[PDB]
Amino acid sequence: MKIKLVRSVIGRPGNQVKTVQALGLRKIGDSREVSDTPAVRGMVKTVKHLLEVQE
RNA sequence: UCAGGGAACUGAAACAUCUCAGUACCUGAAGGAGAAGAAAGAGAAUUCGAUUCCGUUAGUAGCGGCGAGCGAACCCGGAU
RNA sequence: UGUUAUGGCGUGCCUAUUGAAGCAUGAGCCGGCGACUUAGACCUGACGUGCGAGCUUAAGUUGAAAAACGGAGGCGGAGC
RNA sequence: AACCGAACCUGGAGAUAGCUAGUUCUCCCCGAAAUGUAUUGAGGUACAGCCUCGGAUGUUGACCAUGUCCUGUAGAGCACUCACAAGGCUAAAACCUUAUGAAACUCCGAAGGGGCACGCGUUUAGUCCGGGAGUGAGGCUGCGAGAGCUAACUUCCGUAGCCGAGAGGGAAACAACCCAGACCAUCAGCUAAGGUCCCUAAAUGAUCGCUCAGUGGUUAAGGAUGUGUCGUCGCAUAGACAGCCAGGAGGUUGGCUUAGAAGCAGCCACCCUUCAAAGAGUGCGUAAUAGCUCACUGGUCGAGUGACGAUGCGCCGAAAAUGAUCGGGGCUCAAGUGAUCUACCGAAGCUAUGGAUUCAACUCGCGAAGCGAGUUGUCUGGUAGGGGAGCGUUCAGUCCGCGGAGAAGCCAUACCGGAAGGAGUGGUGGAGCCGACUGAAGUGCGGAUGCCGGCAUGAGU
RNA sequence: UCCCAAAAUGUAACGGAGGCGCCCAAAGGUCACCUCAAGACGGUUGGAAAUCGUCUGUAGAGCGCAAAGGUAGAAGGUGGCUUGACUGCGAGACUGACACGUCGAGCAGGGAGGAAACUCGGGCUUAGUGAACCGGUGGUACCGUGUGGAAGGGCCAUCGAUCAACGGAUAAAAGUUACCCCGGGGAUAACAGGCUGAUCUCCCCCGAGAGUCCAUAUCGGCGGGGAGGUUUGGCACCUCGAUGUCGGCUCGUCGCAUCCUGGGGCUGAAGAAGGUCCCAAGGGUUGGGCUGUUCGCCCAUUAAAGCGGCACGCGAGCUG
RNA sequence: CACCCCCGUGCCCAUAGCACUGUGGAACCACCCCACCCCAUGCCGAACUGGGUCGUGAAACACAGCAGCGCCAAUGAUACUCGGACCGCAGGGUCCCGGAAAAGUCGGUCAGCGCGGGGGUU
Ligand SMILES: [Mg+2]
Ligand SMILES: [Mg+2]
Ligand SMILES: [Mg+2]
Ligand SMILES: [Mg+2]
Ligand SMILES: [Mg+2]
Ligand SMILES: [Mg+2]
Ligand SMILES: [Mg+2]
Ligand SMILES: [Mg+2]
Ligand SMILES: [Mg+2]
Ligand SMILES: [Mg+2]
Ligand SMILES: [Mg+2]
Ligand SMILES: [Mg+2]
């Protein structure tokens, strides 16, 4: 999976805030190649609607 | 400075004990200073040895609706 | 730099508030005055200095266009 | 002795004031709370919760996953408790069939949640000791409940988010809604939400439709041959529907009831006969009559017609007080609305170039850490509060000095520094005075119906 | 203790229901044993249940009280013997801001019941409680201000508390002020405004039925759907360093759910006079008696003598 | 576990329970018999208990058949819901994404697994 942040964290529940933190994002527009493994699969899915899950 | 008489606000988050204080104030007497003073004493060593003042002991002993809070003296150092 | 025209944008300040342009408080304007301090050998901690398993003096004493002396006493040092 | 439910002056006295007001220089780092419990407590205190600073530990913190255990709400169900509908049955209860409702019912029972382990993963916190706090009036919205008229910018709890302490774009305007979290500079760029006729930036864009209402741009029960699209009967050139000419029956004023009611106030039925036909009957009408048409029948024409379901958009139902409107202009030859595609505008978001700050690792300078600089990365909204570095004012000690060809103070100015602030030059002035290090402070002001003084407004009233 | 509480815990309200301030020498410890409610059939005073008997019987009963969980291989129901309804402790946890509170293996001293394993430091559990201060009683020998005693004190145990406004301001305590005073508050009231609309006002839907006959000329049971914001209120948002309060008088102005004039449909409209609904606010809408009145009642008239809004319009305009 | 059955005791603890029916007897079990006292029923040795045949298998029991009742219980579709995104003034409601019941239906079964002792296969 390939991640890119495209939606504000503001006005979003804590958990998503967290997953955004953990997944290592700081500013919308940031991105990062991501590991294909359950825990991290979960990271992305959880806050799917905020990230642009590349492919 | 001593003496005769002697508050309340206030504290204790109320209040009557107690606190504020024997302070504030009134009055009497006196001096340059007073007051105190030569032991029917203090202390626990069979010790010190008139009075007064500073240090300390001690915020200890203790007092207290044992609450708020109040608070010694001996010893020891020094003025004399 | 000064002044100005037109355009865009634009809800004094403070206080008190859940919320102030607020038809909520304060204030005519300027100048000057105007508010977290001082003390206690008090407690408690940060930083720093001197000594360091030891560390300090208080009152006073004598000198002072200067500061030494002064261990009475206090704090470490055994707890329950 | 010009304001007596207790005179006046001085004094205790800076009475107390858990209350109100005020609280003065700068830049930088973090950054709350409006909760729980107790309180003669409820606009106040204590403790904890939440902030900060130091020291310690130094990944235990975060999230997401897998595993395991626990929970009974939602739903459901009716096997118990209570309630409840149709029937049977029986000498009403239980019993049986059919049928139901439950916050305080449960045979059942998710989603989710929570504890513990590990981390198989990616993160970046946690914890403990100690100094300093502030906060203990919250608010709106969504979702789940109670309270309340399933009223309220209502009230009380749970839970998420934002305001509070949050600027920026959008929603005309507008705390909290939507998109987004402001280190500083830049006539640079791409986007979010929202938008792209003109008032403002951008397609009066493209394709297939919908509504004529200005719906759009203030509601409903309900009403209606207003349109659009799907479904059902239906009834039908062997010539219907609507229209037209003509007909319309005999029993029977059907029996019943009535003061009577003869197809039509109300009980009972709704059969017979002829026929091509014509039903004891539509509605109107009288005191019943009567009269007027219908269903059933033929020609004349010649193609469809008729009636319920649904839905899409729209019409009526839709009356309030200063003068109207969708923000306005104006819009149907859409700037309205359903679906679809694409381009552009659009924030202080993301990006670009430049620079500063924060913390960290990397370098060296140094005889030490500590501190300076240099890199790389990182951070940098902010109210109460905590922490850091500094500016300025007087006084004092010390250093260098300065001044009548002229000090301080005053006045002007396009310079300097990251700020507090500093300097240069000129004018005024007429005598004391800068800069630097260190020390002490009655040390910095717009607020206090502040104090003293000066001068304004009302007004030439 | 139930429900609210949103399946962990916790969680408010002057939200919905209900109990406690005890009780038991045995309703305890231990050791044995029995097992319920209730229906049916059949049986004596009985006759409804109840006593006896026989089948069925997850218990639909019981458990001292309120409920919930729990429970029959018993915590349910009898009898024997005992006292643990004990002392000295207490690993480890639950729970609380603290202070309290709760559960608890194991150790010792001594015991009780059982043949024995073993069980026993109160009762199936969850309410039956009250700091500390001051004092009472039994015990103990720790202090005891020169010494030894003694008073007194301390340590153990234990009694005294609707201090229930139940974390309790004192040993000891009620009302009044319109004679009032100060500090504050729009944190919270009365006026008005705001939000809401139960209530109030008006409109529409259905149509039983009244209307000789005929539901709709009129009127409309029961029940339903909306509007207005003029009532009484609910809420409590600005205002308590002041938004003057009822009525009148003067001055007006606006809405329309029109009182009168104007135009219409239907009528159960002969004409005259009315009723009713639709359209329509241009203008107009009298003077007096009673009452502060607003209202309303009445006199005498009128085309009519409308209903509301503007801080229940208008006090820096007057009245009072 | 050579084949069987019987008795005791487990795991499991209703898809292993009930009922209806049949099988078993002198190995085992039970009924049955007497029981003055050991010990005993708040009256009854009914039950506890002591001493034993016969007789029986009727009862109780064991086993076997059966599924009429119990108990178990799919799938499919639905209820509901974590997450995302919307609607209606409101009561309430919807789309996308996972999770996903309860009831009922199909059908499932009257267990299965141990240890030990006894007696049989004339
Ligand atoms: Mg005020
Ligand atoms: Mg004063
Ligand atoms: Mg409705
Ligand atoms: Mg001023
Ligand atoms: Mg009033
Ligand atoms: Mg009011
Ligand atoms: Mg007329
Ligand atoms: Mg006025
Ligand atoms: Mg079932
Ligand atoms: Mg999902
Ligand atoms: Mg959802
Ligand atoms: Mg789904």
Coordinates of all heavy atoms in Angstrom, one line a residue, chain D residues 324-347:
Chain D
rA324 P -44.4 46.0 3.6 OP1 -45.6 45.5 2.8 OP2 -44.2 45.8 5.0 O5' -43.1 45.6 2.8 C5' -43.0 44.3 2.2 C4' -42.4 44.5 0.8 O4' -41.7 45.7 0.7 C3' -41.4 43.4 0.4 O3' -42.1 42.3 -0.1 C2' -40.6 44.1 -0.6 O2' -41.3 44.1 -1.9 C1' -40.6 45.5 -0.1 N9 -39.4 45.9 0.7 C8 -39.3 46.2 2.1 N7 -38.1 46.6 2.5 C5 -37.4 46.6 1.3 C6 -36.1 46.9 1.1 N6 -35.2 47.4 2.0 N1 -35.6 46.8 -0.2 C2 -36.4 46.4 -1.1 N3 -37.7 46.0 -1.0 C4 -38.1 46.1 0.2
rU325 P -41.8 40.9 0.5 OP1 -42.9 39.9 0.1 OP2 -41.5 41.0 2.0 O5' -40.4 40.4 -0.2 C5' -40.5 40.0 -1.6 C4' -39.1 40.1 -2.2 O4' -38.6 41.4 -2.0 C3' -38.0 39.2 -1.5 O3' -38.1 37.9 -1.9 C2' -36.8 39.9 -2.0 O2' -36.4 39.6 -3.3 C1' -37.2 41.4 -1.9 N1 -36.8 42.1 -0.7 C2 -35.8 43.0 -0.8 O2 -35.3 43.3 -1.8 N3 -35.5 43.6 0.4 C4 -36.0 43.3 1.7 O4 -35.6 43.9 2.7 C5 -37.1 42.3 1.7 C6 -37.4 41.7 0.5
rC326 P -38.5 36.8 -0.8 OP1 -39.9 36.2 -1.1 OP2 -38.3 37.4 0.6 O5' -37.5 35.6 -1.0 C5' -36.1 35.7 -0.6 C4' -35.3 34.7 -1.4 O4' -35.6 34.8 -2.8 C3' -33.8 34.9 -1.3 O3' -33.2 34.2 -0.2 C2' -33.3 34.2 -2.6 O2' -33.2 32.8 -2.4 C1' -34.5 34.5 -3.6 N1 -34.2 35.6 -4.5 C2 -33.3 35.3 -5.5 O2 -32.8 34.2 -5.6 N3 -32.9 36.3 -6.3 C4 -33.5 37.5 -6.2 N4 -33.1 38.5 -7.0 C5 -34.5 37.8 -5.2 C6 -34.8 36.8 -4.4
rG327 P -32.8 35.0 1.1 OP1 -31.8 34.2 1.8 OP2 -34.1 35.4 1.7 O5' -32.1 36.3 0.5 C5' -30.7 36.4 0.6 C4' -30.3 37.9 0.4 O4' -28.9 38.0 0.5 C3' -30.7 38.4 -1.0 O3' -32.1 38.7 -1.1 C2' -29.7 39.6 -1.1 O2' -30.1 40.7 -0.3 C1' -28.4 39.0 -0.5 N9 -27.6 38.3 -1.4 C8 -27.3 36.9 -1.4 N7 -26.6 36.5 -2.4 C5 -26.3 37.7 -3.1 C6 -25.6 37.8 -4.3 O6 -25.0 37.0 -5.0 N1 -25.6 39.2 -4.7 C2 -26.2 40.2 -4.1 N2 -26.1 41.4 -4.6 N3 -26.9 40.0 -3.0 C4 -27.0 38.7 -2.5
rG328 P -32.8 38.6 -2.5 OP1 -34.3 38.8 -2.3 OP2 -32.4 37.4 -3.3 O5' -32.3 39.9 -3.3 C5' -32.4 41.2 -2.8 C4' -31.8 42.2 -3.7 O4' -30.4 42.0 -3.8 C3' -32.2 42.0 -5.1 O3' -33.4 42.7 -5.4 C2' -31.1 42.5 -5.9 O2' -31.2 43.9 -6.0 C1' -29.9 42.1 -5.1 N9 -29.4 40.8 -5.6 C8 -29.6 39.6 -5.1 N7 -29.0 38.6 -5.7 C5 -28.2 39.3 -6.7 C6 -27.3 38.8 -7.6 O6 -26.9 37.6 -7.9 N1 -26.8 39.9 -8.4 C2 -27.0 41.2 -8.2 N2 -26.4 42.0 -9.0 N3 -27.9 41.6 -7.3 C4 -28.5 40.7 -6.6
rG329 P -34.1 42.4 -6.8 OP1 -35.4 43.2 -6.9 OP2 -34.3 40.9 -6.9 O5' -33.1 42.7 -7.9 C5' -33.0 44.0 -8.5 C4' -31.9 44.1 -9.4 O4' -30.7 43.4 -8.9 C3' -32.0 43.4 -10.8 O3' -32.7 44.3 -11.7 C2' -30.6 43.3 -11.2 O2' -30.0 44.5 -11.5 C1' -30.0 42.8 -9.9 N9 -30.0 41.3 -9.7 C8 -30.7 40.7 -8.7 N7 -30.5 39.4 -8.8 C5 -29.8 39.2 -9.9 C6 -29.4 38.0 -10.6 O6 -29.6 36.8 -10.2 N1 -28.6 38.2 -11.7 C2 -28.4 39.5 -12.2 N2 -27.6 39.6 -13.4 N3 -28.8 40.6 -11.6 C4 -29.5 40.4 -10.5
rG330 P -34.3 44.0 -12.0 OP1 -34.7 45.1 -12.8 OP2 -35.0 43.8 -10.7 O5' -34.4 42.6 -12.7 C5' -33.7 42.5 -14.0 C4' -33.0 41.2 -14.1 O4' -32.4 40.9 -12.8 C3' -33.9 39.9 -14.4 O3' -34.1 39.8 -15.8 C2' -32.9 38.8 -13.9 O2' -31.9 38.7 -14.8 C1' -32.4 39.5 -12.6 N9 -33.2 39.1 -11.4 C8 -34.1 39.9 -10.8 N7 -34.7 39.3 -9.8 C5 -34.2 38.0 -9.9 C6 -34.5 36.9 -9.1 O6 -35.3 36.8 -8.2 N1 -33.8 35.8 -9.5 C2 -32.8 35.7 -10.4 N2 -32.2 34.6 -10.7 N3 -32.5 36.8 -11.2 C4 -33.2 37.9 -10.8
rC331 P -35.1 38.6 -16.3 OP1 -35.2 38.8 -17.8 OP2 -36.3 38.7 -15.5 O5' -34.4 37.3 -16.0 C5' -33.2 36.8 -16.6 C4' -32.9 35.4 -16.2 O4' -32.8 35.4 -14.8 C3' -34.0 34.4 -16.6 O3' -33.7 33.9 -17.9 C2' -33.9 33.4 -15.5 O2' -32.9 32.4 -15.8 C1' -33.4 34.2 -14.3 N1 -34.4 34.5 -13.3 C2 -34.6 33.6 -12.3 O2 -33.9 32.6 -12.2 N3 -35.5 33.9 -11.3 C4 -36.2 35.0 -11.4 N4 -37.1 35.3 -10.4 C5 -36.1 35.9 -12.4 C6 -35.2 35.6 -13.4
rU332 P -34.7 33.8 -19.1 OP1 -34.0 33.6 -20.3 OP2 -35.7 35.0 -19.0 O5' -35.6 32.5 -18.8 C5' -35.0 31.2 -19.1 C4' -36.1 30.2 -19.1 O4' -36.6 29.9 -17.8 C3' -37.3 30.5 -20.0 O3' -37.0 30.2 -21.3 C2' -38.3 29.5 -19.4 O2' -38.2 28.3 -20.0 C1' -37.9 29.4 -18.0 N1 -38.8 30.2 -17.0 C2 -39.5 29.5 -16.1 O2 -39.4 28.3 -16.0 N3 -40.3 30.2 -15.3 C4 -40.5 31.6 -15.4 O4 -41.4 32.1 -14.7 C5 -39.7 32.3 -16.3 C6 -38.9 31.6 -17.1
rC333 P -38.2 30.4 -22.4 OP1 -38.9 31.7 -22.3 OP2 -39.0 29.2 -22.4 O5' -37.4 30.4 -23.8 C5' -36.7 29.2 -24.2 C4' -35.3 29.5 -24.6 O4' -35.4 30.5 -25.7 C3' -34.3 30.1 -23.6 O3' -33.7 29.0 -22.9 C2' -33.4 31.0 -24.4 O2' -32.3 30.4 -25.0 C1' -34.4 31.5 -25.5 N1 -35.0 32.8 -25.5 C2 -34.2 33.9 -25.4 O2 -33.0 33.8 -25.1 N3 -34.7 35.2 -25.5 C4 -36.0 35.3 -25.8 N4 -36.5 36.5 -26.0 C5 -36.9 34.2 -25.9 C6 -36.3 33.0 -25.8
rA334 P -32.2 29.1 -22.3 OP1 -31.7 30.5 -22.3 OP2 -31.4 28.1 -23.1 O5' -32.2 28.6 -20.8 C5' -32.9 29.4 -19.8 C4' -32.1 29.4 -18.5 O4' -33.0 29.1 -17.4 C3' -31.0 28.3 -18.4 O3' -29.8 29.1 -18.8 C2' -31.2 27.6 -17.0 O2' -30.5 28.2 -16.0 C1' -32.7 27.9 -16.8 N9 -33.7 26.9 -17.3 C8 -33.6 26.3 -18.6 N7 -34.7 25.7 -18.9 C5 -35.6 25.9 -17.8 C6 -36.9 25.5 -17.5 N6 -37.7 25.0 -18.5 N1 -37.4 25.7 -16.3 C2 -36.6 26.3 -15.4 N3 -35.4 26.9 -15.6 C4 -34.9 26.6 -16.8
rA335 P -28.4 29.0 -18.1 OP1 -27.6 30.0 -18.8 OP2 -27.9 27.6 -18.0 O5' -28.6 29.6 -16.6 C5' -27.9 29.0 -15.5 C4' -28.2 29.8 -14.2 O4' -27.6 31.1 -14.3 C3' -29.7 30.0 -14.0 O3' -30.3 28.9 -13.3 C2' -29.8 31.3 -13.3 O2' -30.0 31.2 -11.9 C1' -28.5 32.0 -13.7 N9 -28.6 33.2 -14.6 C8 -28.1 33.3 -15.8 N7 -28.3 34.4 -16.4 C5 -29.0 35.1 -15.4 C6 -29.5 36.4 -15.4 N6 -29.4 37.3 -16.4 N1 -30.2 36.8 -14.3 C2 -30.4 36.0 -13.3 N3 -30.0 34.7 -13.2 C4 -29.3 34.4 -14.3
rG336 P -29.6 28.3 -12.0 OP1 -29.2 29.3 -11.0 OP2 -28.6 27.3 -12.4 O5' -30.8 27.5 -11.3 C5' -31.6 28.1 -10.3 C4' -32.9 27.4 -10.2 O4' -33.6 27.5 -11.5 C3' -32.8 25.9 -10.0 O3' -32.6 25.6 -8.6 C2' -34.2 25.4 -10.5 O2' -35.2 25.5 -9.5 C1' -34.4 26.3 -11.6 N9 -34.1 25.7 -12.9 C8 -33.2 26.2 -13.9 N7 -33.1 25.4 -14.9 C5 -34.1 24.4 -14.7 C6 -34.6 23.4 -15.5 O6 -34.2 23.0 -16.6 N1 -35.6 22.6 -14.8 C2 -36.1 22.9 -13.6 N2 -37.0 22.1 -13.1 N3 -35.7 23.9 -12.8 C4 -34.7 24.6 -13.4
rU337 P -31.6 24.5 -8.2 OP1 -31.6 24.5 -6.7 OP2 -30.3 24.7 -8.9 O5' -32.3 23.2 -8.6 C5' -33.4 22.6 -8.0 C4' -33.8 21.3 -8.6 O4' -34.3 21.6 -9.9 C3' -32.7 20.3 -8.9 O3' -32.5 19.5 -7.7 C2' -33.3 19.5 -10.1 O2' -34.2 18.5 -9.6 C1' -34.0 20.6 -10.8 N1 -33.2 21.2 -11.9 C2 -33.5 20.7 -13.2 O2 -34.3 19.9 -13.4 N3 -32.7 21.3 -14.2 C4 -31.7 22.3 -14.0 O4 -31.1 22.6 -15.0 C5 -31.5 22.7 -12.7 C6 -32.2 22.1 -11.7
rG338 P -31.2 18.6 -7.7 OP1 -31.0 18.2 -6.3 OP2 -30.0 19.3 -8.3 O5' -31.5 17.4 -8.6 C5' -32.5 16.4 -8.1 C4' -32.6 15.2 -9.0 O4' -33.2 15.7 -10.3 C3' -31.2 14.7 -9.5 O3' -30.6 13.8 -8.5 C2' -31.7 13.9 -10.7 O2' -32.4 12.7 -10.4 C1' -32.7 14.9 -11.4 N9 -32.0 15.8 -12.3 C8 -31.7 17.1 -12.1 N7 -31.2 17.7 -13.1 C5 -31.1 16.7 -14.1 C6 -30.7 16.7 -15.5 O6 -30.2 17.7 -16.1 N1 -30.9 15.5 -16.1 C2 -31.4 14.4 -15.5 N2 -31.4 13.3 -16.2 N3 -31.8 14.3 -14.2 C4 -31.7 15.5 -13.6
rA339 P -29.0 13.8 -8.4 OP1 -28.7 13.0 -7.2 OP2 -28.5 15.2 -8.5 O5' -28.6 13.0 -9.7 C5' -28.9 11.7 -9.9 C4' -28.4 11.2 -11.2 O4' -29.0 12.0 -12.3 C3' -26.9 11.4 -11.5 O3' -26.1 10.4 -10.9 C2' -26.9 11.2 -13.0 O2' -27.0 9.9 -13.5 C1' -28.2 12.0 -13.4 N9 -27.8 13.4 -13.7 C8 -27.5 14.4 -12.8 N7 -27.2 15.5 -13.4 C5 -27.3 15.2 -14.8 C6 -27.1 16.0 -15.9 N6 -26.7 17.3 -15.9 N1 -27.3 15.4 -17.1 C2 -27.7 14.2 -17.1 N3 -28.0 13.3 -16.1 C4 -27.7 13.9 -15.0
rU340 P -24.6 10.8 -10.5 OP1 -24.0 9.6 -9.9 OP2 -24.6 12.1 -9.8 O5' -23.9 11.0 -12.0 C5' -23.8 9.9 -12.9 C4' -23.2 10.4 -14.2 O4' -24.0 11.3 -14.9 C3' -21.8 11.1 -14.1 O3' -20.7 10.3 -13.8 C2' -21.7 11.8 -15.5 O2' -21.3 10.8 -16.4 C1' -23.2 12.1 -15.7 N1 -23.5 13.5 -15.4 C2 -23.6 14.4 -16.5 O2 -23.5 14.1 -17.7 N3 -23.8 15.7 -16.1 C4 -24.0 16.2 -14.8 O4 -24.4 17.4 -14.6 C5 -23.9 15.2 -13.8 C6 -23.7 13.9 -14.1
rC341 P -19.3 10.9 -13.4 OP1 -18.4 9.7 -13.1 OP2 -19.6 11.9 -12.2 O5' -18.8 11.7 -14.6 C5' -18.3 11.0 -15.8 C4' -17.7 12.0 -16.7 O4' -18.7 12.9 -17.3 C3' -16.7 13.0 -16.1 O3' -15.3 12.4 -16.1 C2' -16.7 14.1 -17.1 O2' -16.0 13.9 -18.3 C1' -18.2 14.2 -17.5 N1 -19.0 15.1 -16.6 C2 -19.0 16.5 -17.0 O2 -18.3 16.9 -17.9 N3 -19.7 17.3 -16.2 C4 -20.4 16.9 -15.2 N4 -21.1 17.8 -14.5 C5 -20.5 15.5 -14.8 C6 -19.7 14.7 -15.6
rU342 P -14.3 13.0 -15.0 OP1 -13.1 12.2 -15.0 OP2 -15.0 13.3 -13.7 O5' -13.8 14.4 -15.7 C5' -13.2 14.4 -16.9 C4' -13.3 15.7 -17.6 O4' -14.6 16.1 -17.7 C3' -12.7 16.9 -16.9 O3' -11.3 17.0 -17.0 C2' -13.3 18.1 -17.6 O2' -12.7 18.3 -18.8 C1' -14.7 17.5 -17.8 N1 -15.7 18.0 -16.8 C2 -16.4 19.2 -17.1 O2 -16.2 19.8 -18.2 N3 -17.3 19.6 -16.2 C4 -17.5 19.0 -15.0 O4 -18.3 19.6 -14.2 C5 -16.8 17.8 -14.7 C6 -15.9 17.4 -15.6
rA343 P -10.4 18.0 -16.0 OP1 -9.0 17.7 -16.2 OP2 -11.1 17.8 -14.7 O5' -10.7 19.4 -16.6 C5' -9.9 20.0 -17.6 C4' -10.2 21.5 -17.7 O4' -11.6 21.7 -17.8 C3' -9.8 22.3 -16.4 O3' -8.4 22.7 -16.5 C2' -10.7 23.5 -16.5 O2' -10.3 24.5 -17.4 C1' -12.0 22.9 -17.0 N9 -13.0 22.5 -16.0 C8 -13.1 21.3 -15.4 N7 -14.1 21.2 -14.5 C5 -14.6 22.5 -14.5 C6 -15.6 23.2 -13.8 N6 -16.4 22.6 -12.9 N1 -15.9 24.5 -14.1 C2 -15.2 25.1 -15.0 N3 -14.1 24.6 -15.8 C4 -13.9 23.3 -15.5
rC344 P -7.7 23.2 -15.2 OP1 -6.3 23.6 -15.5 OP2 -7.9 22.2 -14.1 O5' -8.5 24.5 -14.7 C5' -8.4 25.7 -15.6 C4' -9.3 26.8 -15.0 O4' -10.7 26.4 -15.1 C3' -9.2 27.2 -13.6 O3' -8.1 28.2 -13.5 C2' -10.5 27.9 -13.3 O2' -10.6 29.2 -13.8 C1' -11.5 27.0 -14.0 N1 -11.9 25.9 -13.1 C2 -13.2 26.1 -12.5 O2 -13.8 27.2 -12.6 N3 -13.7 25.0 -11.8 C4 -13.0 23.9 -11.7 N4 -13.5 22.9 -11.0 C5 -11.7 23.7 -12.3 C6 -11.2 24.8 -13.0
rC345 P -7.5 28.5 -12.0 OP1 -6.4 29.5 -12.2 OP2 -7.2 27.2 -11.3 O5' -8.7 29.2 -11.3 C5' -9.1 30.6 -11.6 C4' -10.1 31.0 -10.5 O4' -11.3 30.3 -10.6 C3' -9.7 30.9 -9.1 O3' -9.0 32.1 -8.6 C2' -11.1 30.9 -8.4 O2' -11.6 32.3 -8.2 C1' -11.9 30.1 -9.3 N1 -12.1 28.7 -9.0 C2 -12.8 28.3 -7.9 O2 -13.4 29.2 -7.2 N3 -13.0 27.0 -7.5 C4 -12.4 26.1 -8.3 N4 -12.5 24.8 -7.9 C5 -11.6 26.4 -9.4 C6 -11.5 27.7 -9.8
rG346 P -7.9 32.0 -7.5 OP1 -7.3 33.3 -7.2 OP2 -7.0 30.8 -7.7 O5' -8.8 31.6 -6.2 C5' -9.7 32.5 -5.6 C4' -10.5 31.7 -4.6 O4' -11.2 30.7 -5.4 C3' -9.7 31.0 -3.6 O3' -9.6 31.8 -2.4 C2' -10.4 29.7 -3.3 O2' -11.4 29.7 -2.3 C1' -11.1 29.5 -4.7 N9 -10.5 28.5 -5.5 C8 -9.6 28.6 -6.6 N7 -9.2 27.5 -7.1 C5 -9.9 26.5 -6.3 C6 -9.8 25.1 -6.4 O6 -9.1 24.4 -7.1 N1 -10.6 24.5 -5.4 C2 -11.4 25.2 -4.6 N2 -12.1 24.4 -3.7 N3 -11.5 26.5 -4.5 C4 -10.7 27.1 -5.4
rA347 P -8.2 32.5 -2.0 OP1 -8.7 33.9 -1.8 OP2 -7.2 32.3 -3.1 O5' -7.7 31.9 -0.6 C5' -8.0 32.6 0.6 C4' -7.7 31.7 1.8 O4' -8.4 30.5 1.7 C3' -6.3 31.2 2.1 O3' -5.5 32.2 2.6 C2' -6.5 30.0 3.0 O2' -6.6 30.4 4.4 C1' -7.8 29.5 2.6 N9 -7.7 28.2 1.9 C8 -7.8 28.0 0.5 N7 -7.8 26.7 0.2 C5 -7.7 26.1 1.5 C6 -7.7 24.7 1.8 N6 -7.8 23.7 1.0 N1 -7.6 24.4 3.2 C2 -7.5 25.5 4.0 N3 -7.5 26.8 3.8 C4 -7.6 27.0 2.5

